[PDB]
Design goal:
The structure is cut from a larger assembly and holds 1 copy of chain A (254 residues), 4 copies of chain B, 1 copy of chain C (281 residues), 1 copy of chain D (304 residues), 1 copy of chain E (60 residues) and 6 copies of chain F. With 281 residues, chain C is an all-alpha fold. Chain C has 8 helices and 2 strands, in the order ββαααααααα. Chain C has a two-stranded antiparallel ribbon with strand order 1-2. Chain E has 60 residues and is an all-alpha fold. Chain F has 53 residues and is mainly α. In chain F, 62% of the residues lie in helices and 0% in strands. The interface between C and D is large, with 101 and 108 residues. The complex binds cardiolipin, bacteriochlorophyll A (2 copies), bacteriopheophytin A, ubiquinone-10, 1,2-diacyl-SN-glycero-3-phosphocholine, spheroidene (5 copies) and 1 more. Chain L: One of its GO terms (biological process) is photosynthesis, light reaction. Chain L: Bacteriochlorophyll a 1 binds at residue 43.
Chain lengths: 254, 43, 281, 304, 60, 53, 53, 43, 53, 53, 44, 44, 43, 53
């Protein structure tokens, strides 16, 4: 089929490249519409619904049938967005115009705003296929032993202000994945509080947490159960801790 | 009906002003295309 | 312009340079100091590309080409019509890329997320620079860099590779290839796995990480984990671009002949050279 | 300041043998292993594999393939182990002579190639079916098979189809480490400059885009791993600040974003389109276009 | 006690100059780092064989 | 032709304004460059030629 | 033919407006370009030929 | 019925204005096609 | 033949109208180009010749 | 024309001014380079030749 | 009445007057410089 | 022309002064490097 | 209006000093430009 | 054969109809082009010869 132009200079090669342009167009449509299942409809700063809802239309709802009888999730949906919707937000408009920030009115690590923001995931924990909780403390996880690395337990917890606040007590693990997610602290104030392993750097003599300072370690959200931890508590904790890279920087030393 | 929150009067005013600006733009453009056609015709 | 959750993150802060000056958004976009810089540089480079092709009289986007100065120009700045445009566009492109990275940084620290992304991008900037800045300087002339044409930097690739015969024999090139292929492979596998869990057979419940781990253990006897695969693909891309930069910085500076003659050090080892057998006997 | 590249503390437990969702447990093994060298970068469990029918087909056929090529390597080396370990890379099970056309080659090298290729055929297709079945038994989607099928498309186009269309098994790829590189070069040189194969350019675009995308995705998910972004299946259904922060990073950066499921959709396509476009661009080389630089000149992306 | 400027205008003037010169010092640091980078590159290139500066052009 | 103002009951003036601003600027730049690439309308080369430079 | 005002009961005016605007503009450009690419319809080349420039 | 929640009257109105704009467009296009035909025909 | 209004009970008219619009425009362009190719139906070349331009 | 001031009832001075500065400086640099691109209109080389330097 | 920005007609007229002052100054400078460049080297 | 002081009500002056320092120093090096390139205008 | 926290008085002061420095800058720069026209003219 | 209607109990109508549209279009676009390739069947070149143009 060499030198065979159907019309003009158009041969199988040209037909194929053009067909590809067409398929590609449809494909960009498909993907940028499937990236709309979360976040849309578009809002203003007032919480309203805006005129520009994008040039790509929000797609038709699908359904996720969850394991362990957790129900049906429909995306896109109003229930989905309204559950994960935050209210009572400690924020103040910086200007009547749009496209400008919104300042935190109070303590942001607590008020759950900015890098310290959290999202109302459901106060039910994360489960494995068998329906057992995903995160167990290493003591309830039968058979779990440190197979390598520095066992942090019992090491002091240095913080961003270089001061010390407590000692590690237990390790919270992803049993199905066999890895350490959270570590627990026996704080000086007599309280137990979790901190994500990804935010704690195990040294030989200690555990360093450069995110937050010491005043903050006490006001960290707690757990209603000492053997389990839900997705909600996880988001609250993780946001609180991560917000210290911005909101406790005047305290961070070295 | 208003997808943006305007009323007919706010719209009418905005439109008078937009029209003023547009006619000014077109006016300068006409002046210039005229000067050009006088300086180097393209037709 | 906002998503249903974009508000509580639109707070002030997270700015390396500037402050209130430039802490705002334009549509979806965040524009700080470095947003202004990258816009300026990008726009200028674009307009200069267009003027360069306008001077040439070419207007086809595929045949538009702004080429570097001659090799005889050496490392001096040339007339705009003989290399100066390419050079200014290179300046502007580099400023734009670095500013994009620093913008990403500002955003990463406003949203309180790590700085892995600008790091990844830095390798790409490093390679672009290796091509248009370093390798020339070490080779003595800007004219050894590539042009800004859709179908002409391919001609630069071809000629530069055939200068040293089949570039395929460069080992660092081999590693770049291998890591690129493995990157595409792992990308497809990750996407397919996740979609196959979330979107299973009809009439079945959503799946979990345990099913992914089990499916790939079944298939090949090992699963790297949900975190390990991201770690892995990231490192694959980075080492690829690392090897790709290493392959080019040593091509015309430390090496000068066909790349095939490199592997002949293994043949020419005295205890199997004279042997008469095989390909090399 | 912990970037989560290397795991600090390892833990383990009784091995995670599996999930019984319709899998035949007897075709599964029961022995595992821990190897901390990986635990640093991933899971350490070299976990149980599945030993099935399709898997046995694949293993047998592909081992015959491998050892066949090694046999011809030996014969080509004079049976001298030192020649073998000298010319190992320069050796080749070169492809049949063009004289035979598409007929069964009337030589040794040629028929050995033909047989090794039959073995590869069996192996690859068995493995594809094994992917389909392992995803059907655990009740998962077949995305992995339709991705692999893309790779198979290119591989076939190179070994089986393109030649049949050209009438010569000479066109197919030799089984060597340097000879298949030489084949690629000679393929480009014979047919114009392959760069001007628009579908080659597209496959390249998607290879580079796959690297782009995986670096993006991985760096993101490690950036939001401090909010458990690594657990994705649970952020598709129960969205948290990880997904929100990633989406908003990319929005504020380039104006658009994705979701913890749609980025996976983007990945599955940048991957397969590398080998879908390649297959087409290789098919069309020599069957529809004997030279690509001239096609470009005629089609306007190359100058007269 | 020392460092005390009674005048409001002189206090504002020395502050603004400090701010401006700070910025110019940042820019100079950046320019100097770029300069050291490129120049060290060229020099290290002078350490290379003569075949580096002989290589044919790709015409592009 | 008597109810065009109703367009602003549809589109938001901020976006429309920015859009048409960009549009006009790029359009103008492209037309100018077009002429500048046609040497019979390149006012610079002309003025060079007309004034003998 | 008389009921065509219901395409507004089926579609959204915003998306259609923007889309068809894009469509008209890109169409105009493609057509002007097709002309320019033909020496007998290039008003510019024709002008420099007609005015003996 | 409405897939977008408009009433027959707002729709009749929208369509009126849309048709007016369209007819203005076509009128100017016709002026131009005529001029072009007089200056340099193609058929 | 009269029951063909029931295809609107299987298909979303929005999807269908968008898809028909796209298909129609692309078909038209394709055809007009297949014509501009053939020198006998390139009405522009035809005009040039007819009018001695 | 009497009521152009309402532009600041639409836009904010801060973003508008950032835009204006960027755009004007960009345009200035662009045109200066356009000129420096011509062996004419390049004040530097012109002066170099005029004074025989 | 309508203000997507907060400024009432009063602040708007003020700001506009000053902005136009600056604009006309800019334009005066540019006109002067263009006349000069015409004297030294005309471009039409 | 006399109400230009109102710009400091728009932009923080600290950052504006730092930014001007940067802008002016960079412009200076730009022109010096432009001039240095030309043998007629190079002084070294 | 006052987006930055400054009043007309503070702004007047700051502008006075800024323009002081500005006129100093322009003075020095026109001096140096004159000297350069002396050395290597460009018009 | 009159019990073929159960096909609508097996297959979804929407999927079938869409697949059918695409199938037929591609087949037809293809057949017309295969015919186009051969000159004896290129109705346009045929016409150019019938009418001697
Ligand atoms: C003049 C022309 C002008 C231009 C014309 C343009 C016209 C455009 C029309 C629109 C086309 C858009 C197509 C894209 C939509 C896909 C979106 C998506 O990601 O998921 C959709 C969605 C995915 O579902 P899901 O979310 O995963 O969950 C579904 C289940 O719950 C759970 O899932 P599951 O496990 O049950 O099934 C998973 C599967 C759902 O889909 C399926 O199950 C079926 C998928 C197709 C498999 C193959 C069909 C069976 C027969 C194959 C024959 C092969 C012969 C070889 C030997 C046999 C091998 C088996 O998920 C997918 O992602 C399906 C998409 C797969 C696409 C094909 C990828 C491999 C192709 C590699 C190349 C090989 C062929 C050569 C190509 C070149 C030829 C020249 O599926 C659909 O919407 C329906 C399926 C669509 C059927 C296929 C039609 C499109 C194929 C296009 C391929 C590219 C062709 C080249 C382009 C032209 C070049 C010249
Ligand atoms: C990598 C080493 C070689 C190189 C070798 C090749 C080869 C080989 C090919 C190209 C191809 C491409 N290269 Mg490259 N390319 C190089 C350097 C660059 C640079 C750069 C700033 O340095 C850019 C912007 C490009 C641009 C491009 C695109 C025109 C095209 C697809 C890339 C792609 O999909 O990216 C992946 C990322 C994305 C998918 C994002 C999309 C980015 C867009 C498409 C880039 C367009 C830039 C625009 C036209 C110019 C700016 C104004 N290359 C260097 C010099 N490149 C392919 C092609 O088809 O060329 C005709 C091809 O065959
Ligand atoms: C100098 C020679 C020509 C050239 C000639 C070719 C040729 C010829 C080809 C390409 C092709 C490709 N080239 Mg090249 N290529 C050139 C220039 C470039 C440049 C560049 C920067 O200049 C780049 C980046 C690329 C890019 C690419 C890729 C985008 C593409 C192949 C992707 C792939 O996955 O292949 C590898 C993928 C596969 C082969 C998939 C195979 C999968 C099967 C299932 C493997 C079986 C496994 C087996 C049993 C082994 C078992 C292992 C054990 C179990 C562990 N080329 C030059 C200019 N290139 C390919 C293409 O698509 O052509 C258009 C191709 O064939
Ligand atoms: C979508 C395009 C990319 C791709 C994807 C891809 N490949 C795949 C898959 C997917 C999605 C699998 O599921 C499957 C797999 O198991 O991956 C881990 C596979 C696979 N692709 C493989 C390799 C591979 N993929 C490659 C690339 C690519 N395949 C593309 C870049 C390449 C190269 C060089 O391009 C190679 C070499 C294998 C690891 C595996 C195919 C397994 C197979 O068929 O094995 C047969 C042989 C034996 C069982 C015996 C071997 C005997 C010797 C001892 C060795
Ligand atoms: C975990 O989940 C995830 C998501 O979801 C949460 C995601 O979305 C993503 C993100 C990934 C995607 C969206 C997938 C698609 C991505 C690609 C195909 C990559 C290639 C991208 C492109 C081709 C688009 C590139 C666009 C660019 C560079 C933007 C161009 C814009 C400008 C230059 C304008 C900039 C304007 C500025 C700075 C302001 C102007 C200033 C004024 C004063 C005016 C990932 C990775 C992810 O992992
Ligand atoms: C040339 C290739 C595309 C270049 C980028 C063009 C788009 C851009 O930069 O911004 C679009 C803008 C930039 O952001 P934006 O904020 O203007 O987009 C808003 C998008 N909606 C309205 C849907 C919310 O983004 C979009 O339009 C969204 C979808 C774009 C998808 C582009 C993916 C291209 C991938 C190419 C792969 C194949 C390569 C071969
Ligand atoms: C190779 O191909 C070539 C190009 C050579 C040949 C082929 C060419 C082809 C395929 C050409 C196809 C052309 C087509 C299909 C053109 C179609 C054009 C149309 C449909 C144009 C429509 C224009 C409409 C306009 C301009 C409408 C304007 C409307 C207004 C300004 C009114 C504003 C509306 C308001 C305010 C709405 C009221 C709202 C409320 C709430 C009351
Ligand atoms: C190949 O292609 C080539 C280029 C060769 C040929 C084709 C060229 C093409 C296709 C060109 C197309 C050109 C077009 C479509 C041009 C359109 C131009 C338009 C529509 C311009 C409009 C300008 C309007 C202006 C400048 C309006 C300004 C308005 C103001 C300044 C006032 C703003 C409003 C205010 C203050 C009111 C606010 C009130 C309240 C109550 C908030
Ligand atoms: C490639 O094609 C080429 C380049 C060859 C040809 C094409 C060239 C083109 C298309 C060029 C276009 C140029 C244009 C569109 C130029 C437009 C210039 C304008 C609109 C300039 C406006 C300048 C305004 C200035 C400088 C205003 C300055 C104002 C001040 C410094 C004081 C303002 C004070 C305020 C606001 C204080 C009061 C504030 C409060 C909050 C009370
Ligand atoms: C240590 O020494 C011993 C002997 C013990 C073991 C050593 C073994 C060695 C050294 C093995 C080495 C193997 C090598 C170097 C393999 C390399 C393979 C490469 C690089 C292959 C590259 C590309 C191959 C392709 C694309 C082949 C495609 C083939 C097909 C698609 C087959 C399709 C079917 C064909 C050709 C016809 C047969 C069809 C039917 C239906 C019968
Ligand atoms: C291709 O383009 C090239 C580069 C070739 C040519 C074009 C160049 C361009 C477009 C250049 C543009 C330059 C511009 C716009 C420069 C503007 C400079 C300005 C507005 C400078 C303002 C400076 C103000 C200063 C230095 C004020 C300082 C005030 C203080 C530090 C307060 C303290 C007061 C003192 C010490 C005074 C006591 C007596
Ligand atoms: Fe992922």
């Amino acid at each position: 089929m060499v030198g065979v132009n159907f019309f003009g200079d158009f041969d199988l090669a040209s037909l194929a490249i053009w067909s590809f342009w067409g398929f590609l167009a449809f494909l960009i449509y498909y993907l940028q519409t499937e990236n709309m299942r979360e976040g849309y409809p578009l809002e203003m700063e007032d919480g309203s619904v805006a005129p520009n809802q994008g040039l790509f239309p929000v797609p038709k709802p699908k359904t996720f049938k969850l394991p362990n009888g957790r129900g049906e999730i429909v995306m896109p949906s109003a229930e989905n967005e309204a559950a994960h919707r935050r209210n009572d937000l400690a924020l103040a408009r910086t200007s009547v115009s749009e496209g400008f920030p919104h300042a935190p009115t109070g303590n942001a690590l607590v008020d759950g705003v900015g890098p310290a923001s959290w999202v109302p995931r459901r106060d039910e924990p994360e489960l494995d296929a068998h329906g057992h909780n995903k995160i167990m403390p290493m003591a309830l996880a039968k058979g779990f032993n440190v197979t390598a690395g520095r066992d942090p337990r019992g090491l002091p917890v240095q913080a961003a202000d270089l001061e010390v606040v407590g000692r590690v007590s237990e390790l919270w693990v992803d049993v199905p994945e066999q890895m350490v997610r959270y570590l627990e602290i026996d704080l000086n104030s007599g309280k137990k509080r979790l901190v994500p392993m990804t935010l704690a750097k195990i040294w030989a003599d200690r555990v360093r947490v450069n995110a937050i300072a010491s005043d903050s370690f006490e006001n960290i959200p707690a757990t209603r159960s000492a053997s389990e931890v839900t997705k909600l508590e996880e988001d609250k904790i993780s946001g609180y801790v991560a917000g210290g890279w911005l909101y406790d920087a005047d305290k961070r030393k070295r | 009906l208003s997808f943006t929150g305007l009323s007919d009067e706010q719209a009418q005013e905005l439109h008078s002003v937009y029209m003023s600006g547009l006619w000014l733009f077109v006016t300068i453009a006409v002046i210039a295309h005229i000067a050009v056609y006088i300086w180097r015709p393209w037709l | 312009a906002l998503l249903s959750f974009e508000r509580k993150y639109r707070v002030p802060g997270g700015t390396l340079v500037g402050g209130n000056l430039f802490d705002f958004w334009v549509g979806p976009f965040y524009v700080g100091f470095f947003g202004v810089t990258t816009f300026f540089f990008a726009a200028l480079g674009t307009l200069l590309i267009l003027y360069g092709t306008a001077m040439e009289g070419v207007w086809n986007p595929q045949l538009i080409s702004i080429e570097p100065p001659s090799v005889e120009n050496g490392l001096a700045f040339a007339p705009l019509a003989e290399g100066g445009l390419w050079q200014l566009i290179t300046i502007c492109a580099l400023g734009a890329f670095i500013s994009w990275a620093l913008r990403e940084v500002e955003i990463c620290r406003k949203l309180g997320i790590g700085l892995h992304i600008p790091f990844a991008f830095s390798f790409a900037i490093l390679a672009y620079a290796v091509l248009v800045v370093f390798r020339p300087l070490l080779m003595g002339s800007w004219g050894y860099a590539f042009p800004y044409g859709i179908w002409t930097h391919l001609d630069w690739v071809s000629n530069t590779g055939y200068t040293y015969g089949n570039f395929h024999y460069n080992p660092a090139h081999m590693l770049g290839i291998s890591f690129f292929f493995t990157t595409a492979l792992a990308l497809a596998l990750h996407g397919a796995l996740v979609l196959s869990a979330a979107n299973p057979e009809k009439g079945q419940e959503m799946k979990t990480a345990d099913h992914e781990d089990t499916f790939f253990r079944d298939l090949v006897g090992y699963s790297i984990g949900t975190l390990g695969i991201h770690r892995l693909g990231l490192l694959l891309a980075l080492m690829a671009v690392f090897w790709s930069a290493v392959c080019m910085i040593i091509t015309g500076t430390i090496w000068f002949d066909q790349w095939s003659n490199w592997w002949y050090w293994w043949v020419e080892l005295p205890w199997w050279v004279d042997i008469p057998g095989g390909v090399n006997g | 300041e912990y970037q989560n590249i290397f795991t600090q503390v390892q833990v383990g437990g009784a091995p995670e043998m599996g999930l019984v969702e319709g899998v035949d447990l007897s075709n599964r093994t029961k022995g595992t292993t821990n190897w901390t060298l990986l635990g640093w970068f991933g899971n350490a469990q070299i976990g149980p594999i599945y030993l099935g029918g399709w898997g046995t087909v694949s293993l047998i056929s592909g081992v015959l393939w491998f050892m066949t090529i090694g046999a011809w390597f030996w014969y080509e080396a004079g049976f001298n182990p030192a020649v073998f370990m000298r010319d190992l890379f320069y050796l080749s099970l070169d492809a049949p002579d063009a004289k035979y056309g598409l007929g069964v080659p009337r030589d040794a090298e040629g028929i050995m190639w033909f047989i090794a290729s039959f073995f590869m055929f069996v192996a690859v297709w068995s493995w594809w079916i094994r992917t389909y079945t392992r995803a059907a038994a655990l009740g998962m989607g077949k995305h992995t098979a339709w991705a692999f099928l893309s790779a198979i498309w290119l591989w076939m186009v190179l070994g089986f189809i393109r030649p049949i269309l050209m009438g010569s098994w000479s066109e197919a790829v030799p089984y060597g480490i340097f000879t298949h590189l030489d084949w690629t070069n000679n393929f480009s040189l014979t047919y114009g400059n392959l760069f001007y194969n628009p579908f080659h350019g597209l496959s390249i675009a998607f290879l580079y885009g796959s690297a782009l995308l995986f670096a993006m995705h991985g760096a993101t998910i490690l950036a939001v791993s401090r909010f458990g972004g690594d657990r994705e299946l649970e952020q598709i259904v129960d969205r948290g600040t990880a997904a929100e922060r990633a989406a908003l990073f990319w929005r504020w950066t380039m104006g658009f974003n994705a979701t913890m499921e749609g980025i996976h959709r983007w990945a599955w396509w940048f991957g397969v389109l590398v080998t879908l476009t390649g297959g087409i661009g290789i098919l069309l080389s020599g069957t529809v276009v004997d030279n690509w630089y001239v096609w470009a000149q005629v089609h306007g992306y190359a100058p007269v | 006690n020392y460092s005390h400027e009674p005048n409001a205008v002189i206090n504002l003037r020395v502050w603004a100059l400090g701010q401006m010169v700070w910025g110019a010092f940042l820019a100079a640091v950046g320019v100097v780092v770029v300069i050291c980078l490129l120049v060290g590159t060229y020099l290290a290139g002078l350490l290379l064989p003569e075949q580096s500066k002989q290589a044919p052009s790709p015409y592009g | 032709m008597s109810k065009f103002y109703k367009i602003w009951q549809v589109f938001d003036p901020r976006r429309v304004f920015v859009a048409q601003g960009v549009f006009l600027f790029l359009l103008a730049v492209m037309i100018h460059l077009i002429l500048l690439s046609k040497p019979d309308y390149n006012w610079l080369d002309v003025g060079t030629a007309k004034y003998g430079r």
